[PDB]
Write an enzyme that holds these catalytic residues in place. Structure first.
Site, mmCIF file in Angstrom:
data_model
loop_
_atom_site.group_PDB
_atom_site.id
_atom_site.type_symbol
_atom_site.label_atom_id
_atom_site.label_comp_id
_atom_site.label_asym_id
_atom_site.label_seq_id
_atom_site.Cartn_x
_atom_site.Cartn_y
_atom_site.Cartn_z
ATOM 1 N N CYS A 1 23.270 29.877 123.568
ATOM 2 C CA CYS A 1 24.618 30.054 123.846
ATOM 3 C C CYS A 1 25.004 29.865 125.064
ATOM 4 C CB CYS A 1 25.196 31.400 122.954
ATOM 5 S SG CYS A 1 24.901 33.008 123.654
ATOM 6 N N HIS B 1 29.323 38.887 129.061
ATOM 7 C CA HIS B 1 29.119 38.382 127.770
ATOM 8 C C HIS B 1 29.522 39.616 126.709
ATOM 9 C CE1 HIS B 1 26.690 36.911 124.775
ATOM 10 N NE2 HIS B 1 26.510 35.741 125.522
#
Ligand SMILES: [Hg+2]
Ligand SMILES: [Hg+2]
Ligand SMILES: [Hg+2]
Ligand SMILES: [Hg+2]
Ligand SMILES: [Hg+2]
Ligand SMILES: [Hg+2]
Ligand SMILES: [Hg+2]
Ligand SMILES: [Hg+2]
Ligand SMILES: [Hg+2]
Ligand SMILES: [Hg+2]
Lengths: 336, 340, 333, 326
Positions: A152, A179
Site C-alpha cells: 500500500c 498512516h
C-alpha cells in the site's frame, strides 16, 4: 477473466466489491478460499465500518457466499496447492491476499494447482517483478506468472518519486508516512506476534512509529532509485486514510510552484495518481480509486544559498486505493 | 521570601502551571501561585483544576467560593478583570511575576499592561514578536538580564524543536532543515466539520477522525532562539487524533558526513542530566510522554541517515507533551526570573 | 511470615495486580507466561491507559526485575508443570489466563503444590465480590472466582439498592470501554460473533454479558430477577452501569441517593462521587464501583414507577483492586 | 409549479438537507459564513463523504452542478429577500419564526423543539394533524424522531404505563475537543468528547407528549455521549399493560415497519457505523429486545438505531414535501 481470492480479509473483500462494481458496467470473482465460516464472511462483505454497506443482496450457505443471485464457493484449504478452484470454478488468476505465500517459491503452490498467474498483495522478494500500476506495469510479459503488487505504501510513494525524479532528479530522499492504524495492530496494550515493543501498543490512542520497507525497496519498482531512499511510518488513530511525506535533495533548483506544476501534468487522466488542491484531510480520501493523490498545498522548498530541500506529499486510501491498483494489474494480466 | 506568580488566564496551560507549582511547593522550590485572573466562574475552574481527561485527577482537596478557588485549605483569589492593568494582585496578593497564557496579550506592547499594574516581569506563553527575547529554557535562558521584564516562551513546538536543532547544529552544523510535527489535536480545532474562526478549510474539519495538515511558524522563527539558524528551517504540522502527546521529525542537510550511531551519541550527551531535553530509547509511543516534565525527548530509535555518495539526509526525532512539557519549561523560566 | 503468590498469565489484569501489590507496599515471587520477559517488563513499565510505573523495571533472559527484586518468569504452557512451589515457595496462585475458568481446570494448580487459587469469571465454586459476600469464604475453600469486572460493579449497587428498597425485577446496560477481545478493524474473530467482528474504536457495539443473570451466585435473593447487556464504546478504559428496576418501595431520587450513600461511607469497594464526573475520571480509581447520585432518576405516572441508578468503574483497575482485596483475605484464612 | 425551499442556517443539518433535496427544490440560503467555506463544507464531509457533484463558489453564492444558489447574509430573518427550513437555533418559537412569515414565506419548518403553541411533527407518526393554517411547525429533535415511532407502536400494541430511555449518542457540535469552559457552564459539557463517555440531559422523552398525547407524562430519559462522530441508539425500558415475550414484541413492532420509510428494521446484528447515511428516522433492532420477569413483574427493553444527523434531516424533508399538499 476469472479471479480466485485466497484470503478473504479486508483487502480480499474490497477486491470483491471492486470487481463487482466493475462487472456491473462491462472480470469477475468465482471463488474464494478462507478458513472463516461463510456466514461471517458474508456479513463482513455486506457491512463495513470504513467503507459502508454494500448495495447488493448478500447471504451465505454452508460452503459459499451469495451475492445478487450468484454463488461464490468458499473453500477452506490451508495449503494453496490443495485448492481445487481451477477445474471446479474456472479460476484464471489468483489474488493472493493471505500474507502466507509471500515469495515466488511459496506461491508456486498456486501454480501447481493450475492457475495461470498470481498477484501477491505484498512485497514478495527480488526474484520476481514488483508492479505498481501506471509506473512500471509495462515491464510485464507473458512469461510473468508470479508477480508482486508491493505494498500500500509502495503504491502511494512510487508515482510521486517516479515523476519527481524524472522532472528534477532525486539524489537522495527520506519518507514518512502518517498512516492509519491496521489489523496487525492492537486495541489495547499487550503481546503481539514478533514481540515488537511498538506493535504491542494501543492503536487508537497512540501515535506509533513503525518500520516499513517501502522506500528501501523502491528500486524493485524504480531501479534508478535503488539505494536512494529510506523511510518509516507513524501509525495514528484513524481507521483508514493515509499520507506520505517525501523530503529530497534534488539535482535541480526549484520553487514550490514549479514542483507543483510539473507533477500536476502527470496526474492528467491518470487513474492511479491523482491530484487535489482543495486542502483536503484524510477522511476525504477514503473510498477513492487512486493509488496516490498529490497534494500541492503541502509542497515546501527550503533553501539557503544552494542547499535545497524539497518536501512533497500525497494522500491515499491505504485500503481502497491499493486494492484498486491491484485490480488494474489483474486486468493487465488478461492482456499479457 | 518565595517567588509569587499571578496567572492570567486559567485555561489548560494556566491550570497545569498551577498544578506544577503546587507540586513543586510540596518539596519547596519557593515558587507559589498567589492569584489568578479569569472570567469563568470559580466553581467551574475549580472543577477543571481537579478533574482532567488528559492529566488525571489532582490529589488535593479542591473547592470554590464565589471569588476564589480553595486547595488544601489555601485561598487563591480569582480576579475577573478583562483588562490586565486592572488586576490588583500585586498590592493585594504579592504577585511578582505574571504568567500570561490568555492569548490576548501576546506582545511586548500588550503585556506592558501587567507592568503598569506593577508586575516585576511577565512570561508570555506564546510567540510574541521580535522586540523582546524568546527563551527556551536550557537553550538560551543565559541571555536573560535584569532589564528583561517581558519575555516570551515561544510555543510548545519551539520548546521541542529548539534543543534538538540546537545541539544537532552545534555538533554537525545544520545547513538547512525542514520539520514535520505529528501533533495531538488542540483547543483551536473542531469536534465536527463546520465553520471556524479565520475561515481555514482545514481548521474547519473534525479532529478526532482526521489527519489534518496545519501551519506552524516554529521553524521559521527559530532564529529568535538560535540566531545562527535564522532562515535555515521551515516546517509544518499534522494534527492527529490523540488528545495529547506529540513528536517532531527533523530532516536536515548537515556539514558533516555522519552515521546514525554518531548522531545518536552526539545528541545523547546533551540530554544527560538535562531536565529540559530528555532521552528515551525504550521504543515508546505518544502516551508514554503524557505527563513528562521535559520540553523535548530525544528518540534515538528513529534516527535515520540516508546516503548516496556525497549527498546526505539526516533525520532525527523528538517526543513531547505539548501541554505538560511546555508548561514545565515555563515554570523553569519563572524560577529563573528570581535570579535576575 | 508471608504467603507467596504466583501469577499465571501476565496479561493486562495480571500486570495491574503486580502494580497494585507493589504499591500496597507493607508479595509476588514468580510469574508464568508465554511472552518474553523483555516484552513483559516493557508492558509492565509502560501503559497507554494507566501510565508509567514509577519503579525501576528491567528484564533478563528468564525474569523481570523491579526495584532490585527478582521475579522469575516460567514459560510452561501447562499449568501443572509450573514449579514455583518448590523453586519459589509459592503458596497462592493468581490465575488470569482465561484458559482455566473452572474448578475442574484450576485443579492443575493444586496438583502442583498451591494452597489456594483465585480465578475470575462456574457454579460448583464460590464467586466472591469483596465487600458484598467475602464472609462466605472458609478454610476449606481452595479455588474461588473473583467474578467478572462487571459483576464487581453491579453487585454492590444491586445489593444495597435491594436491601433498602427491594428489587422486584431489573435490567442493566453497561456502557463499557472496548476490550482485548474486540478488534481494531472489521474482521473475523474467535467465536464468530457478528458484532465481535467489528471495529471497536469507531462503533457502538452491543455485547452479551452474563453478570446480571449470574448475580444469583453472589446475591441469592436476586437470582432470576435481573437481566442485562453491554454496549461497547470507543474509549480505552472506563465504564458505567445503568440499572433500571421495579422496586418494592415508592421513592424519590434523593431518597434513593441518601439510602445508597450510607453504604459507601468508608467503603473502599463501593464508592460515591457527586462531582459530575465523566468516564476518564474513574481511570485509576480503586473502587469496584462508584455510585453516581447525579444520574439517579425516578420515573412515575400515578402508582407505576421505574427507578434508574448508575455507577462508574475502571473495568481494569477497579476489578483488579477487588481481586487484590480477595487475595489478601483468601491467602490469609 | 414546484416547491421552493429556503434554508436559513447552512450548518451540518442545513447542508445535509441541501444534499438530500438534491438527491431527490431549494433556491436560496441565508448564512453568515463566507460562501467559500460553505461550499467546501458542502462538498467535503468527514462523516458523510464527498458530494458527488461539482461544487464551487462565488462572492455571494454556491454553485452546484451548474445551478446557482444565492447565499444571503442577514442576521434578522425579516430581512432576507427570497417554505423555509429554519436550522439556525435562533428562531425557536412561533413568535420568533413569525419573522420568516413577515418576509413572505408560506410555511416554516423549525428543526428543533419550539414550544407547545405549535405542532411538533414526527413524520409517519403524527403528520396527519397538519393543516393549512399551520404556518410554523417544529420537527422536534433528532432524538424525538427516533423515539417517537418506537414508543408509538409499542404503546399501541401493548400499552406503556411508564418508561425510561437512554440514548447512546454520538458526540455533537455543542461539545468540546478538550476540557475547558463552555457556554452555560455545565461541568460535563466542559469535558473532552472523544475520550469520555459523558452523561447529558435530554428532553425528548418528557416532551413526547406533544407528538403522542397518550404518552404525555409517562416517559423520561437521558443520554450518554460517546466517542464516535455519528450514529446513535436508544434503549427504552418500559412497563407495559400486557404480558409479552421478546418474540411477541418483535413480531408486533416489525409489522409496523413494513414499507415504512420513517421507521425501519434490521436484524443483521449491526453496529452504529452501519446506520450512518441511512434514511430512516429510526431503525428497530430486534436482536436487542429483552423481557425480564419474576412473578408478574415484567420489564421490557427495546432498542432502535439512528443516524442522528441524516435520519433527522431526511425526516425533515419528508415533512417539507408534505407542506405542499396543504
Ligand atoms: Hg486474508
Ligand atoms: Hg506517497
Ligand atoms: Hg477497492
Ligand atoms: Hg522536536
Ligand atoms: Hg506541568
Ligand atoms: Hg486473576
Ligand atoms: Hg454497576
Ligand atoms: Hg489495580
Ligand atoms: Hg429510539
Ligand atoms: Hg439527509
Amino acid at each position: 477473466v476469472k479471479i480466485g481470492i485466497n484470503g478473504f480479509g479486508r483487502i480480499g473483500r474490497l477486491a470483491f466489491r471492486r470487481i463487482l462494481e466493475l462487472g456491473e458496467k462491462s472480470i469477475e470473482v468465482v471463488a474464494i478460499n478462507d478458513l472463516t465460516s461463510p456466514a461471517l464472511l458474508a456479513h463482513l462483505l455486506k457491512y463495513d465500518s470504513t467503507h459502508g454497506t454494500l448495495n447488493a443482496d448478500v447471504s451465505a450457505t454452508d460452503d459459499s457466499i451469495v451475492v445478487n443471485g450468484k454463488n461464490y464457493r468458499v473453500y477452506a484449504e490451508p495449503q494453496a496447492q490443495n485448492i481445487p478452484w481451477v477445474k471446479n470454478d474456472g479460476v484464471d488468476f489468483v489474488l493472493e491476499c493471505t500474507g502466507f505465500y509471500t515469495s515466488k517459491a511459496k506461491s508456486q503452490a498456486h501454480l501447481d494447482a493450475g492457475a495461470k498467474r498470481v498477484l501477491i498483495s505484498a512485497p514478495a522478494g527480488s526474484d520476481l517483478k514488483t508492479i505498481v500500476y501506471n509506473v512500471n506495469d509495462d515491464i510485464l510479459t507473458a512469461d510473468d506468472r508470479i508477480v508482486s503488487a508491493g505494498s500500500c505504501t509502495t503504491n502511494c510513494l512510487a508515482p510521486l518519486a517516479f515523476f519527481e525524479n524524472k522532472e528534477f532528479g532525486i539524489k537522495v530522499g527520506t519518507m514518512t508516512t502518517i498512516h492509519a492504524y491496521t489489523s496487525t495492530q492492537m486495541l489495547l496494550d499487550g503481546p503481539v506476534r514478533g514481540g515488537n515493543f511498538r506493535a504491542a501498543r494501543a492503536a487508537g490512542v497512540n501515535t506509533i512509529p513503525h518500520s516499513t520497507g517501502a522506500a528501501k525497496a523502491l528500486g524493485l519498482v524504480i531501479p534508478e532509485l535503488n539505494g536512494k531512499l529510506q523511510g518509516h511510518a507513524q501509525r495514528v488513530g484513524v481507521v483508514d486514510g493515509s499520507l506520505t511525506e517525501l523530503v529530497a535533495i534534488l539535482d535541480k533548483k526549484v520553487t514550490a510552484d514549479e514542483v507543483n506544476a510539473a507533477i500536476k501534468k502527470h496526474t492528467e487522466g491518470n487513474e492511479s495518481f491523482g491530484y487535489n488542491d482543495d486542502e483536503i484531510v484524510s477522511s476525504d480520501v477514503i473510498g477513492t480509486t487512486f493509488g496516490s493523490i498529490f497534494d500541492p498545498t503541502q509542497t515546501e522548498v527550503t533553501s539557503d544559498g544552494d542547499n535545497q530541500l524539497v518536501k512533497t506529499v500525497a494522500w491515499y486510501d491505504n485500503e481502497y486505493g491499493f486494492t484498486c491498483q491491484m485490480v488494474r494489474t489483474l486486468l493487465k494480466f488478461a492482456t499479457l
